[PDB]
Amino acid sequence: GSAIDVIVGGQFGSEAKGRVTLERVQHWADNGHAVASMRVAGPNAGHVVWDQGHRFAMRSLPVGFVDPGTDLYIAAGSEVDIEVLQQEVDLVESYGYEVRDRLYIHPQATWLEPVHRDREASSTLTAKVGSTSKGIGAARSDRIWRVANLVGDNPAFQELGRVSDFTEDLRSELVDGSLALVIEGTQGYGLGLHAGHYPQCTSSDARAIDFLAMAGINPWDLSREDLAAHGFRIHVVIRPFPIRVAGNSGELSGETSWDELGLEAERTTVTNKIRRVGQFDPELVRRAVLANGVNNVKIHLSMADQLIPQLAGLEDLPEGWRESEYAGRLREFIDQIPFNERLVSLGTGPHTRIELFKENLYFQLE
Amino acid sequence: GSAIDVIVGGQFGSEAKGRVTLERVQHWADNGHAVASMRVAGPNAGHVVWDQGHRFAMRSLPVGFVDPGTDLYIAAGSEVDIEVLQQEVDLVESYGYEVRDRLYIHPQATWLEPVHRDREASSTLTAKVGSTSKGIGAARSDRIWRVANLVGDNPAFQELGRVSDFTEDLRSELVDGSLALVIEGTQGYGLGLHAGHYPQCTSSDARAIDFLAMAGINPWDLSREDLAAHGFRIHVVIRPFPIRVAGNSGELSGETSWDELGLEAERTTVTNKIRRVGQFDPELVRRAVLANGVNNVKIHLSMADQLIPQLAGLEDLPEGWRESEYAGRLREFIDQIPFNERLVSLGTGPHTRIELFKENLYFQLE
Numbered sequence: 001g002s003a004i005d006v007i008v009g010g011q012f013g014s015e016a017k018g019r020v021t022l023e024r025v026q027h028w029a030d031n032g033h034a035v036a037s038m039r040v041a042g043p044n045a046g047h048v049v050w051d052q053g054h055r056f057a058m059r060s061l062p063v064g065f066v067d068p069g070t071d072l073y074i075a076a077g078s079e080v081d082i083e084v085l086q087q088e089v090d091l092v093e094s095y096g097y098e099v100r101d102r103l104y105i106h107p108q109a110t111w112l113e114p115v116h117r118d119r120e121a122s123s124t125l126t127a128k129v130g131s132t133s134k135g136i137g138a139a140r141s142d143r144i145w146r147v148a149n150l151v152g153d154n155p156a157f158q159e160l161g162r163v164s165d166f167t168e169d170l171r172s173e174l175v176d177g178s179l180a181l182v183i184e185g186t187q188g189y190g191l192g193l194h195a196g197h198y199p200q201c202t203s204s205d206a207r208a209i210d211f212l213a214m215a216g217i218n219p220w221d222l223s224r225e226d227l228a229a230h231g232f233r234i235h236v237v238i239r240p241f242p243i244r245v246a247g248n249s250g251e252l253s254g255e256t257s258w259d260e261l262g263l264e265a266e267r268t269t270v271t272n273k274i275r276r277v278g279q280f281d282p283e284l285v286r287r288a289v290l291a292n293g294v295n296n297v298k299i300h301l302s303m304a305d306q307l308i309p310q311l312a313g314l315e316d317l318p319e320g321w322r323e324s325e326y327a328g329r330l331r332e333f334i335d336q337i338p339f340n341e342r343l344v345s346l347g348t349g350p351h352t353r354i355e356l357f358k359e360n361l362y363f364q365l366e
Numbered sequence: 367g368s369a370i371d372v373i374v375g376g377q378f379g380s381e382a383k384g385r386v387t388l389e390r391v392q393h394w395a396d397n398g399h400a401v402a403s404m405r406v407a408g409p410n411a412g413h414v415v416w417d418q419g420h421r422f423a424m425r426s427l428p429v430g431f432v433d434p435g436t437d438l439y440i441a442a443g444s445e446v447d448i449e450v451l452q453q454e455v456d457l458v459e460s461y462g463y464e465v466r467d468r469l470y471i472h473p474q475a476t477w478l479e480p481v482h483r484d485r486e487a488s489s490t491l492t493a494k495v496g497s498t499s500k501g502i503g504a505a506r507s508d509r510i511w512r513v514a515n516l517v518g519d520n521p522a523f524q525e526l527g528r529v530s531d532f533t534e535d536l537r538s539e540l541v542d543g544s545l546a547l548v549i550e551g552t553q554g555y556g557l558g559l560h561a562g563h564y565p566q567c568t569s570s571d572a573r574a575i576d577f578l579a580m581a582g583i584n585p586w587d588l589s590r591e592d593l594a595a596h597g598f599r600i601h602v603v604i605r606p607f608p609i610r611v612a613g614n615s616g617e618l619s620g621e622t623s624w625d626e627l628g629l630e631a632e633r634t635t636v637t638n639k640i641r642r643v644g645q646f647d648p649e650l651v652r653r654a655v656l657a658n659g660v661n662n663v664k665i666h667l668s669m670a671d672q673l674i675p676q677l678a679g680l681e682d683l684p685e686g687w688r689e690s691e692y693a694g695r696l697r698e699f700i701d702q703i704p705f706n707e708r709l710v711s712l713g714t715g716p717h718t719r720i721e722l723f724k725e726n727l728y729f730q731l732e
């Protein structure tokens with residue numbers, strides 16, 4: 001059977017899609033199922049995963065690189081900065097990962113060039129909207145004007161992976177075989193161009209359907225049987241203390257400080273700037289779930305350990321839970337998560353979580 | 367029961383999505399079912415429908431205006447030129463149609479302003495790629511840079527319809543009980559930004575999933591029962607002599623001339639320039655159907671009367687059909703349509719077609 005997982009952010013980004021994406025890749029991989037890891041969009045966000053004691057903040061290479069048997073795809077609907085990809089390939093190779101012979105880079109992706117970074121960095125974008133100024137918008141604007149170059153136009157990408165129009169081969173594997181495709185989305189619903197905060201937003205929308213359009217794969221490409229087995233899943237990742245990037249980046253409900261929360265300060269991957277942080281806003285998450293398509297949503301509550309420090313690093317509830325004060329605290333927070341009947345996981349650290357369902361059992365049962 | 371129809375082009379545009387869209391609106395309306403007519407994207411193409419002896423080439427107003435009971439939506443994922451919309455409202459009102467009290471214009475749509483038209487018209491776009499230079503790309507570029515204004519920023523739009531964030535009201539109507547939503551796509555698969563002809567292409571992709579993303583409605587928002595009733599349909603419209611816009615607009619297989627084909631020359635709605643015309647290319651249509659998602663595709667063969675002049679204006683096959691030489695010509699052409707088991711209709715004129723299935727019977731039954 002085939003499956004499509006799309007991992008998306010329910011707030012303004014940095015909800016831990018990297019962690020959840022890798023968890024999904026390893027779900028299929030550890031069960032011996034063929035699996036592919038695809039990244040879409042552009043390098044204006046890093047997705048953090050841990051493996052064997054190392055922390056990887058990836059902007060371009062799919063986080064499925066951690067699993068040796070996973071094919072890695074950079075979708076047609078991407079912007080690819082070759083200096084970023086070169087650095088990430090060099091980085092993982094220096095830790096013994098092998099990626100070049102299983103990395104597929106679509107030739108129709110936009111080539112994000114130095115001039116795109118320069119154009120954003122010298123513009124009013126950061127001052128006006130808090131942009132990372134990493135060139136993604138400038139590249140997309142050039143693509144719209146049909147003056148951008150494509151990945152297929154730069155032979156240097158062939159040193160890093162296979163530059164090939166793989167989309168129909170991939171669709172065929174889903175239709176005609178048994179492939180699990182994990183699509184790593186970026187940022188979060190509330191940053192979407194049309195989600196309500198414009199102009200304090202990013203240059204695309206950030207729903208599952210946007211990332212599927214970028215991937216060039218349709219959920220209805222799956223067979224009736226595979227859809228009936230719940231083969232199409234949208235993983236909406238949320239955190240209890242929503243963040244935004246530093247600066248003039250838009251409204252943040254209940255904005256507070258890392259110190260007031262008793263939490264270590266967090267910094268953005270692509271700029272190292274301190275994140276803004278606020279209190280949980282269920283209305284944003286409600287709108288995100290509705291926009292993504294509630295019938296296929298599974299909700300992942302990341303950083304439950306920031307709400308309940310006693311959970312840090314655990315993969316099961318601690319012994320004295322029923323008798324503790326913080327059992328009610330967690331239950332009360334869960335009560336006000338919209339659509340909480342779809343909650344499937346509690347994140348407890350950068351590489352740990354409490355799984356609410358017997359995912360491996362249900363795989364074996366199909 | 368609810369339903370979503372998305373009407374798309376299988377080639378380079380002007381396949382007759384206007385005609386097919388109106389046919390879909392009237393299918394629901396003539397059966398007394400609640401129906402909504404939505405347009406997405408921008409006014410770089412006209413969709414031609416006929417009603418009561420008049421020809422309407424619509425760039426902005428949904429063609430469902432022809433049916434008095436149909437709500438009309440301009441989606442969030444749109445570019446709206448107010449001069450175009452004003453002229454089209456004025457035009458239909460002069461023929462007795464009433465639209466202003468049933469027209470809903472999303473405030474998050476981009477406001478396409480005169481400066482966007484001027485920027486394209488004075489640029490190299492038309493010379494380089496055959497662009498209509500109607501400002502859609504320049505407006506999308508400003509939206510990407512977060513410098514565009516929105517429909518919600520111009521009170522003048524409120525003179526023409528209701529400016530309201532209707533998306534969740536619309537989604538609720540679909541989820542909770544019998545609405546048919548007809549989404550009028552534009553252009554055609556082969557013009558897509560990532561479909562393979564870049565830079566001789568338009569500034570977006572043109573698949574069903576792109577138009578659904580613009581609409582803000584997901585096919586999987588439909589209930590299990592409604593999907594099981596085939597509630598989600600992608601109508602891929604093709605013509606036997608594919609066209610392109612005039613000029614340096616890209617490769618056109620088997621390019622010929624209107625005189626060589628024995629057909630009246632056709633002109634584009636938005637520029638009045640003469641269309642280029644070629645011979646049917648099955649590979650393009652195969653790629654279009656695959657990209658749209660074959661499992662939900664119904665194929666409409668428009669302009670069958672250009673292939674078989676004896677069909678012009680007919681709603682049924684002519685009397686002597688079995689004995690004619692035309693039967694073989696039509697049969698052979700259908701044989702080489704990709705996925706021709708999904709053929710549902712033969713267009714025979716600007717407002718006539720031969721339906722291959724008993725659509726009204728199916729509606730009453732299922």
Ligand SMILES: Nc1nc2c(ncn2[C@@H]2O[C@H](COP(=O)(O)OP(=O)(O)O)[C@@H](O)[C@H]2O)c(=O)[nH]1
Nearest residue numbers: 014015016017018046047048303347348349350
């Ligand atoms: N304390 C805690 N940290 C997490 C958890 N999950 C992920 N992290 C981390 O918190 C962060 C989220 O940032 P980021 O990875 O950029 O999110 P992404 O962009 O959505 O993938 C990273 O530093 C992660 O390593 C969790 O469950 N608990």
Ligand SMILES: Nc1nc2c(ncn2[C@@H]2O[C@H](COP(=O)(O)OP(=O)(O)O)[C@@H](O)[C@H]2O)c(=O)[nH]1
Nearest residue numbers: 380381382383384412413414669713714715716
């Ligand atoms: N001869 C013939 N013309 C059709 C048919 N269907 C539509 N037309 C017309 O052919 C054309 C297609 O152009 P257009 O409406 O712009 O296509 P659209 O952009 O896809 O909606 C228009 O002039 C239509 O009125 C058909 O079945 N036979």
